[PDB]
Every structure is written in structure tokens, then in C-alpha cells.
Amino acid sequence: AEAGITGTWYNQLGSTFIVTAGADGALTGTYESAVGNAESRYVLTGRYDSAPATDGSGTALGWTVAWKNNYRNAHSATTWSGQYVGGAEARINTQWLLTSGTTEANAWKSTLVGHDTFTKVKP
Amino acid sequence: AEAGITGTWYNQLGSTFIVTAGADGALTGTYESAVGNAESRYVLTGRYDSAPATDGSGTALGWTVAWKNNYRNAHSATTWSGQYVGGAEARINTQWLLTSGTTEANAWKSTLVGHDTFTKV
Amino acid sequence: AEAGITGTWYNQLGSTFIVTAGADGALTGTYESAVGNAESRYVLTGRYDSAPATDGSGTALGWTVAWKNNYRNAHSATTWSGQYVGGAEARINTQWLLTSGTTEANAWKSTLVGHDTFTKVKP
Amino acid sequence: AEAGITGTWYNQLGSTFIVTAGADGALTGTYESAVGNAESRYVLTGRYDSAPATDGSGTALGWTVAWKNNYRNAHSATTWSGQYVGGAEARINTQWLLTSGTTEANAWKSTLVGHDTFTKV
Ligand SMILES: N=C1N[C@H]2[C@H](CS[C@H]2CCCCC(=O)O)N1
Ligand SMILES: N=C1N[C@H]2[C@H](CS[C@H]2CCCCC(=O)O)N1
Ligand SMILES: N=C1N[C@H]2[C@H](CS[C@H]2CCCCC(=O)O)N1
Ligand SMILES: N=C1N[C@H]2[C@H](CS[C@H]2CCCCC(=O)O)N1
């Protein structure tokens, strides 16, 4: 449901995610990371699959943040892939991939993988 | 490097995607796949880092496709993270995560992972 | 430290891991999963990097379980990659990959990825 | 299929590994890589599923290598999960996870992921 996803969310590292889910399955917003070579806010864009199922399944979504803004440029990008679960305690559970641009030679070590869980605070 | 990301790309599986790269880091276009509970075109949206570095590195980027359109709804979304490299043969090398919406009981098995290499050939 | 890793551990799904760390960096034991097409115990083998650093870094380790035993055979195998962290509350935090054998055609969907955290109970 | 996993395998990077497959599901041998803080041979231990299925599927397997030997200690371990396929050209297609031991502060960035394809050529 766009509505339930729309809002302010935080994860265990202390990062802030501000998102608006549109009618057409779109996600746009900003991300404020607490870690890495990233200073301030960064623009994020994603999609979410607007017609989930009835049942108590989660809504699948994903989004991307390129770590470049007017203050910094980390030459890397992260994509988060997960599910939105609503209720009194709404959560977004994800797995992410962080890729840094590298030379051919170090490409075998350009991607990190991990997972993040977000808790909603505001709409 | 340069506009170069913009265009039509193909992968091993036969999938095709057409993208437009904007001067400020945005990626927009459509994806049509060859495998899964997918049928037709789907919208894709992503980002790329508009200012790569100048030690022949690739340009980091990522994009998402929710698998729902006017014909099908597979209740899943795929994200591709990787880097673009130009030259006589430009390619995008990625690793992807495909998550399906499940009930909590099946959450442990909701995400698949793989890799895809796209070329304009 | 072999000693700290040796013991009985459980994760959030309710699975049991029994392991012995040997002097030479080896891990051998048994795994009892709570989920999947897996019934009973399965043999596990791994390695752990026996000389970590001084500092409060974790000890890197990994192990494999092939889901075939005398009662079942799921034609799949999982590998867990993580770090052991000791202290009063010793934990093993991992990320795993589950691969099922498939035909060439469905190979794009043969691997699942996720994460597990284990808590020690016994030595 | 059959003994077939046993032998010397090579990957794109130049890495080589020699393995012995036992009738009951065990895999043992040595790994020598071409990249990273690695120098010489390392011991590897894994498992394979000794009874694959009879719809031309691959044989699921996995193995681990801790990167410590009498010469180096990179304080990391790599696990490869994938499947073996025989035929004129047998290959092992894998995805791997490489974890480095960190302090809690750097745990978020302790694991790399990739893919490797091994052949006996
Ligand atoms: N909130 C989170 N921040 C870290 C993880 C995923 S991406 C990462 C921050 C990286 C910052 C930019 C960089 O260092 O490349 N979750
Ligand atoms: N070109 C690719 N197609 C498959 C992989 C990643 S996304 C996937 C197609 C999935 C279609 C929808 C589905 O079956 O869930 N690469
Ligand atoms: N304790 C755990 N069990 C599940 C995860 C990782 S492997 C998985 C169980 C799968 C059982 C066998 C199978 O279904 O293939 N953690
Ligand atoms: N053949 C491969 N070599 C690299 C990847 C996965 S394991 C890795 C070598 C790492 C060596 C030790 C290190 O640098 O940490 N594939």
C-alpha cells in the first residue's frame, strides 16, 4: 500500500530514509547514512510491487542510492531488496549489495552484501 | 563512459532493457525479460554515480524492476548493483537480488541472488 | 580460539549446530535444521582462520552442510560465511548461500541468500 | 556426474584447486589462488550431495578455505556454494562469500560476494 510505506524510517546503524510511494508503484525520497564515505542526504529511487496479495504476505520493493551529492562522491551505489510488512509495528527487512567502481583487476572485490531492517517512525 | 550507458542492452538470458541516463545521476527506461513469471515490459528506475573517477574504473550504478504491469503481477522485485565499463565493447556487470513477498513463515527463503552481464550486442 | 567455538549453538529459526574446532583450523560437527526438506542430522565440515588478531576483531570461519543423510536427500547444499565473536555472550553472525541442483534452464534460480545469528549454549 | 568432481580445476582468475570427492559426500584438497592476501596453498574442506537426482540437474556442493597457512594469515575465510555439471566440458558454477574478521564498528562491511566458474582446462 503506498500509504503504509510512505514515511520516515530508521535502521539499526542510525541511518534515515524518507520515502513517498506513488500510485504507479514508484518510490522517491532521500537517504541519510550514518556510515561510510557519505556526507548528508542522497536521492533514492525505487519501485514496489502496488498490488501485493491478502494475505499476511509482505510487499516486495527495492531502491537504489548512488553515493554522490554536492558535498561528496564515493563512486559507489547500493541497492536494497526486501519486503514491507505492515501492522502496528511496520518493518522493511532487506538485503543490500554495495558496488564500488574499480579497475578490471579489482573487480572481484567491488561488491559488499549485508542486511538492514527499518522501523517506521513518521508518515 | 559518457552518455554511453543510454541505449538498448541485452544479457545472456535474452532479456532486454532500454535506458536513459540523465546528467544528474538518474536512470529510467523499460525492461522486458526472458525468464520467470514476467510477461511484456516493466518500468525500471535507478541511479548511477554522474561523476565516476578519472584510474580507469567503472561507473557504479543500480536499478530496480517490480514485476507488476497491466498483464502480470509476480509479487516480487529485482535490484541489480554493478558497474558500467565503456570501450569498443561496453558492458554492465551486475549481481542481483530477487525478493518475493512471503508470509513470515517463508521469509528465510524469499531472496534469490545471481549475476548478469549486459552488452549492446 | 578452537575452544570458544567448540560447543552447541542455536539460531533464531530453532536449528542446532554441534561443532568441534580442531588445532589445525578445522570444524566438524552436525547440524539439525528446523526448516526445509531436511529430516534429522546432517554432517558439517568447515575451517576457521585458528590465529585471529588482539584485538576485539571476530574470528572468520565458514562451513558447509549438504542436505543428504540416510533418511532424506534435498539435492541442495548451504555454506555459511561469518565471524565468531567471544565474550560472555558469544555469537556467530553469518550470511549463507543455499544452492539446489537444477537443469541449465533454471540455474538462474538455484541459489537463495540470507543470514543467521547463533547463540552458544553448551561447550 | 560420477567420480568426475575429483581432479584439478581452474577458474578465470587463474586459481587452481585439487579435490578428492569421497563416496559419502566429502570433499578434500588444496586451493592456491591468484588474487588477494594469499600466498601458496591452503587446505579446503567441503561436501556435495553423493546422490544427485537422476532430470539432468547439477550436483549441489560447497567448500570453505580459511586464508591462513604457514606463510600468510589474511584473517578471512571464503565459502563457495554452487553445482557441478559433467559432460564433455565439466564445470562447477559457484557464487562465493568472503568474510574478513572486523571489530563491531566495521561489521557492516565485512563480507564481499562474487561468482567463479571452474573448468579442468
Ligand atoms: N544505512 C546504511 N549504510 C550502509 C548500509 C548500506 S550502504 C552503507 C553506507 C555506505 C555510504 C557510502 C559509501 O561508503 O560508499 N546501510
Ligand atoms: N534477466 C534476468 N531475469 C531473471 C534474473 C533476475 S530478475 C529475473 C526474472 C524474474 C521475473 C519475475 C519472477 O519470476 O519473479 N535475470
Ligand atoms: N538453520 C537454517 N536452516 C535454513 C537456513 C539455511 S539452510 C536452511 C534449511 C534448508 C533445509 C534443506 C533444504 O530445504 O534444502 N538456516
Ligand atoms: N579465486 C578467487 N579468488 C578470490 C575470489 C574468492 S576468494 C578470493 C581470494 C582471497 C584471498 C585472501 C584475501 O585477500 O582475503 N575468487
How was this entry determined? Answer: X-ray
Q: Assign residue B40 a region (left: φ > 0; alpha: ψ between -120 and 50; beta: otherwise).
A: left
Alpha-carbon span D76 to C120, nearest angstrom? 22
In chain A, the number of structural domains is: 1
Residues on chain B touching C109 (C-beta within 8 angstroms)? 35-36, 98, 112, 114
Asked if the C-beta of A12 comes within 8 angstroms of chain C's C-beta atoms, the answer is no
For residue C38, which ligand has an atom nearest its CA? 3
Whose CA is closest to D62, among D49, D44, D47, D41? D47
Residues on chain D touching B115 (C-beta within 8 angstroms)? 95, 115
Q: C2: part of which helix (H) or strand (E)?
A: helix C2-5
> In Å, how far are A65, A109, B68, B105 from A113, measured between CA atoms?
15, 11, 26, 23
> In Å, how far are A44, B41, B44, C93, D85 from B18, measured between CA atoms?
20, 10, 9, 40, 34
Nearest protein Cα to ligand 1, atom 11: A36
**Cα B51 to chain centroid, rounded:** 20
Give the residue numbers spanning the domain of C104: 1-123
**Is B113's CB within 8 Å of C114's CB?**
no
Alpha-carbon span A10 to A29, nearest angstrom? 14
CB-based burial label for D8 (10 Å; 0-12, 13-18, 19+): exposed
This PDB structure is determined at a resolution in Å of 1.6
**Is B64's CB within 8 Å of A62's CB?**
yes
Cα D18 to ligand 1 centroid, rounded to whole Å: 38
Nearest to C57 among D47, D51, D103 (CB): D103
As separate numbers, helices (DSSP H) first and strands (DSSP E) second, chain A gives 1, 8
Going D61 to C41 to C118 to C27, the CA torsion angle's sign is negative
State the CATH number of the domain containing residue D31.
2.40.128.30
What DSSP line would sit under B15-38, residue for residue? -EEEEEEETTTEEEEEEE-SSSS-
Residue B105, number of CB atoms within 10 A of its CB: 9
Q: How do strand B59-68 and strand B16-22 relate by DSSP bridges?
A: unpaired
Mutating which of A94, A115, A116, A117 best tests the C interface, going by the most C Cβ atoms within 10 A? A115
* Atom in ligand 3 nearest the alpha carbon of residue C35: 9
Pocket test for ligand 3, best of C9, C10, C13 (most atoms within 8 A of CB): C13
Cα A35 to ligand 1 centroid, rounded to whole Å: 6
